[PDB]
Design a protein around this motif. Structure first.
Motif, short mmCIF file in Angstrom:
data_model
loop_
_atom_site.label_atom_id
_atom_site.label_comp_id
_atom_site.label_asym_id
_atom_site.label_seq_id
_atom_site.Cartn_x
_atom_site.Cartn_y
_atom_site.Cartn_z
N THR A 264 -8.97 0.25 136.87
CA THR A 264 -8.48 0.51 135.52
C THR A 264 -7.47 -0.55 135.12
OG1 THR A 264 -8.81 2.88 135.79
CG2 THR A 264 -7.25 2.17 134.09
N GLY A 265 -7.66 -1.14 133.94
CA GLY A 265 -6.72 -2.13 133.45
C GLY A 265 -7.25 -2.95 132.29
N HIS A 266 -8.56 -3.18 132.24
CA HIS A 266 -9.11 -3.86 131.08
C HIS A 266 -8.87 -3.02 129.82
CE1 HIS A 266 -11.02 -7.45 132.65
NE2 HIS A 266 -11.59 -6.76 133.63
N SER A 267 -8.70 -3.70 128.69
CA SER A 267 -8.43 -3.01 127.43
C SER A 267 -9.65 -2.94 126.53
CB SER A 267 -7.25 -3.66 126.69
OG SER A 267 -7.48 -5.02 126.45
N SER A 268 -10.79 -3.46 126.97
CA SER A 268 -12.05 -3.28 126.28
C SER A 268 -13.17 -3.23 127.31
CB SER A 268 -12.29 -4.34 125.20
OG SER A 268 -13.37 -3.93 124.35
N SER A 269 -14.40 -3.15 126.80
CA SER A 269 -15.58 -3.01 127.64
C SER A 269 -15.62 -4.07 128.73
CB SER A 269 -16.82 -3.23 126.78
OG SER A 269 -16.92 -2.20 125.83
N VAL A 270 -16.07 -3.65 129.91
CA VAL A 270 -16.33 -4.56 131.02
C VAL A 270 -17.81 -4.89 130.99
CG1 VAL A 270 -16.11 -4.85 133.49
CG2 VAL A 270 -14.45 -3.51 132.24
N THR A 271 -18.13 -6.18 131.05
CA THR A 271 -19.47 -6.69 130.80
C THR A 271 -20.17 -7.18 132.05
OG1 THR A 271 -18.52 -8.85 130.46
CG2 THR A 271 -18.76 -7.45 128.52
N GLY A 272 -19.45 -7.34 133.15
CA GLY A 272 -20.05 -7.83 134.38
C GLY A 272 -19.06 -7.73 135.52
N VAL A 273 -19.60 -7.80 136.73
CA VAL A 273 -18.81 -7.64 137.94
C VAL A 273 -19.44 -8.45 139.06
CG1 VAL A 273 -19.99 -5.50 138.62
CG2 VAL A 273 -17.64 -5.92 139.41
N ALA A 274 -18.59 -8.95 139.96
CA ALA A 274 -19.04 -9.73 141.10
C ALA A 274 -18.09 -9.53 142.27
CB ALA A 274 -19.10 -11.21 140.74
N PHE A 275 -18.62 -9.69 143.49
CA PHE A 275 -17.82 -9.67 144.71
C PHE A 275 -17.59 -11.10 145.19
CE2 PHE A 275 -19.56 -5.39 144.97
CZ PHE A 275 -18.49 -4.65 145.49
N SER A 276 -16.41 -11.34 145.76
CA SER A 276 -16.15 -12.56 146.49
C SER A 276 -17.02 -12.59 147.75
CB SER A 276 -14.68 -12.59 146.89
OG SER A 276 -14.39 -11.55 147.80
N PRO A 277 -17.26 -13.79 148.31
CA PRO A 277 -18.08 -13.89 149.53
C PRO A 277 -17.57 -13.07 150.69
CG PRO A 277 -17.77 -16.06 148.57
CD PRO A 277 -16.90 -15.12 147.77
N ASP A 278 -16.25 -12.91 150.84
CA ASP A 278 -15.73 -12.08 151.92
C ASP A 278 -15.76 -10.59 151.58
OD1 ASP A 278 -13.44 -11.67 150.34
OD2 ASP A 278 -12.09 -12.73 151.69
N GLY A 279 -16.15 -10.24 150.35
CA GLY A 279 -16.24 -8.86 149.93
C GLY A 279 -14.92 -8.18 149.63
N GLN A 280 -13.79 -8.87 149.79
CA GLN A 280 -12.50 -8.22 149.64
C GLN A 280 -11.91 -8.35 148.25
OE1 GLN A 280 -12.15 -6.25 152.41
NE2 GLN A 280 -14.08 -7.38 152.59
#
Length: 286
Positions: A264-280
């Protein structure tokens, strides 16, 4: 909200990347984990470091950039645009190729795991496959509405596509349609393969992520987002699923479908997501 945010797996915000002048539509991590690429309606890809600061702005598209991806070797960036092209760039931000052939907006892009094939999704209802010299190799026809996203299986032999026709389709490299995943009740906005290749995740405007086997049979429905789900990704270890939503959050789920975290923290719609290679680290676009 024009930012990318970087988070840890516990829900803690680590950085906010500020500088795009319109909505951010997609995000990707470089394979060394140190650089983040973001796509934006301001017609640019921006490259950022994980410490929260802008490195470069890749101008050149003539309309909104709708997605971005890094090659496995990290040396090529691919961007998709409403200008009907995919552009390939080096890490200096220099343009190497413009892939022309789609007849309407390009909505997403992916590299094959071997780094030698690019897949593009388009509102023209097709997926196209290309090499890094910009040559068109194959057109995948079968969706009945806009294609919104594309992904390669970890072994590189199967392509998955998401569409406003409410399906995911699975294809081979010869363009043959292999399976259709039917079950979402609204447009499908994104698709991803688990790292072992045995689970497909799809995101939908029906507010769910669905998880499917490789025969296209529904295994689970992840409910909880309060608006459209706009993207989905698996962690490199396969143990966490991330979903992005117009409800302004990312949710993290285990493979049993249990909600682990809401970011929680974005102030509008979230349009995409990705993980770093280490997954952290998780990156979200808004």
């Amino acid at each position: 909200d024009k930012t990318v945010k970087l988070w840890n797996r516990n829900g803690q915000l680590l950085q906010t990347l500020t500088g795009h002048s319109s909505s951010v539509t997609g995000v990707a991590f470089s394979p060394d984990g140190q650089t983040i690429a973001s796509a934006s309606d301001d017609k640019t890809v921006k490259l950022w470091n994980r410490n929260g600061q802008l490195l470069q702005t890749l101008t050149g598209h003539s309309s909104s950039v709708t997605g971005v991806a890094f090659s496995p070797d990290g040396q090529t960036i691919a961007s998709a645009s409403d200008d009907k092209t995919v552009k390939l760039w080096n890490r200096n931000g220099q343009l190497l190729q413009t892939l022309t052939g789609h007849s309407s907006s390009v909505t997403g892009v992916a590299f094959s795991p071997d780094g030698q094939t690019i897949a593009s999704a388009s509102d023209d209802k097709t997926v196209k496959l290309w090499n890094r010299n910009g040559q068109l190799l194959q057109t995948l026809t079968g969706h009945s509405s806009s294609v919104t996203g594309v992904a390669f299986s970890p072994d590189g032999q199967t392509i998955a596509s998401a569409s406003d026709d409410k399906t995911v389709k699975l294809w081979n490299r010869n363009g043959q349609l292999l399976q259709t995943l039917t079950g979402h009740s609204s447009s499908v906005t994104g698709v991803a393969f688990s790292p072992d290749g045995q689970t497909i995740a799809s995101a939908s405007d029906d507010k769910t992520v669905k998880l499917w086997n490789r025969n296209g049979q529904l295994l689970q429905t992840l409910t909880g987002h309060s608006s459209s789900v706009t993207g989905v990704a698996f962690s490199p270890d396969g143990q966490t699923i991330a979903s992005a939503s117009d409800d302004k959050t990312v949710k993290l789920w285990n493979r049993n479908g249990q909600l682990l975290q809401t970011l929680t923290g974005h102030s509008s719609s979230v349009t995409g997501v990705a993980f770093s290679p280490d997954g952290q680290t998780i990156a979200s676009a808004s």
